[PDB]
Design an enzyme around this catalytic site. Structure first.
Site: not given
Ligand SMILES: Cc1cc(-n2ccnc2)cc2nc(-c3c(NCc4ccccn4)cc[nH]c3=O)[nH]c12
Length: 295
Positions: A148-149, A162
């Site tokens: 997800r990052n 991030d």
């Protein structure tokens, strides 16, 4: 102005044009557009424009800006680049390198039958590991590595995004504990779960979970275990099960990343060296691994 400490990264808003929406971001909507003079040889560049809700205080806007300012220190093909900041006046904006395919978790789920070949999975793994090796070399510990990052480019290149940043979107990937703060428990090392400390070794643990997400098209790790059951399972040596039809060598890499003793885990450099041969030709010229800075 939404005045924080402006610096050389400030870009006049007249240089930015917002075309259309990309999607909802943690602090507000993200748009795609063009920015003039943000890249050396380019008069104008296609970019992503992150905004903050019209409803937001000076503090929250400064937060949004401070959060983005960590990437001011990164310059790596495998880490999403920060291109500018519009902090003077409203609206507050953050200009970033455009990654058309969104976050890697979403991209992965979009491939569900209702998938990447081993060679394509190795390519993603190598790109993610190269971005991480670059950060760790520069003394940065991510603390929230997860699909997800990570972001996916038009040409399918994977890059590190991030810390958090995609926390309000996948709220169930987080749990409130350890000084009662939101933590990505299903991605955390046993030592981090115990003392709340993050290191490059714990980033490697998380990398193993990312490989697992790729191999399962982003299923929830430890599906069937509650958040509290996860903490206990992992802290006591429990490991994720080899995904169905997962190539042996991919699971082998996961097990190495999931060694209980952090010192037994390979480094991101060691991971790359083990799959170097499988990386598409251009990896030599763009990667941190083969750069003069790597040594
Ligand atoms: C939110 C979003 C959605 C996109 N999309 C819709 C449909 N297919 C893709 C593409 C995209 N690129 C960015 C970018 C960013 N948004 C951070 C962020 C927040 C929430 C979720 C994911 N990413 C940042 C830098 N570059 C981007 O291209 N954000 C997006």
């Amino acid at each position: 102005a939404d005045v924080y400490v402006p610096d050389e990264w400030e870009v006049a808003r007249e240089k930015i044009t917002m075309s259309r929406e990309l999607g909802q971001g943690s602090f507000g909507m993200v748009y795609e557009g063009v920015a003039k003079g943000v890249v050396k040889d380019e008069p104008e560049t296609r970019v992503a424009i992150k905004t903050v809700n019209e409803a937001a205080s000076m503090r929250e806007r400064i937060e949004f800006l401070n959060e983005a300012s960590v990437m001011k220190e990164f310059n790596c093909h495998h880490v999403v680049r920060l291109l500018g900041v519009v902090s003077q006046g409203q609206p507050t904006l953050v200009i970033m390198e455009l990654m058309t395919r969104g976050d890697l978790k979403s991209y992965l789920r979009s491939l569900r039958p209702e998938p990447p070949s081993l060679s394509k999975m190795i390519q993603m793994a190598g790109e993610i590991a190269d971005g991480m090796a670059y950060l760790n070399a520069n003394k940065f510990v991510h603390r929230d590595l997860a699909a997800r990052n990570c972001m996916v480019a038009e040409d399918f290149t994977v890059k590190i995004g991030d810390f958090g940043m995609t926390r309000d979107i996948y709220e169930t990937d987080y749990y409130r504990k350890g000084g009662k703060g939101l933590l990505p428990v299903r991605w955390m090392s046993p030592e981090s779960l115990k003392d709340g400390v993050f290191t490059t070794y714990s980033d490697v643990w998380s990398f193993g979970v990312v490989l697992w997400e790729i191999a399962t098209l982003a299923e929830q790790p430890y599906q069937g275990l509650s958040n509290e059951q996860v903490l206990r399972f992992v802290m006591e040596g429990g490991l994720l099960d080899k995904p169905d039809n997962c190539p042996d060598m991919l699971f082998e890499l996961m097990r190495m990343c999931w060694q209980y003793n952090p010192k037994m885990r390979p480094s991101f450099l060691e991971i790359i060296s083990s799959i170097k041969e499988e990386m598409e030709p251009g990896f030599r010229e763009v990667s941190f691994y083969y750069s003069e800075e790597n040594k």
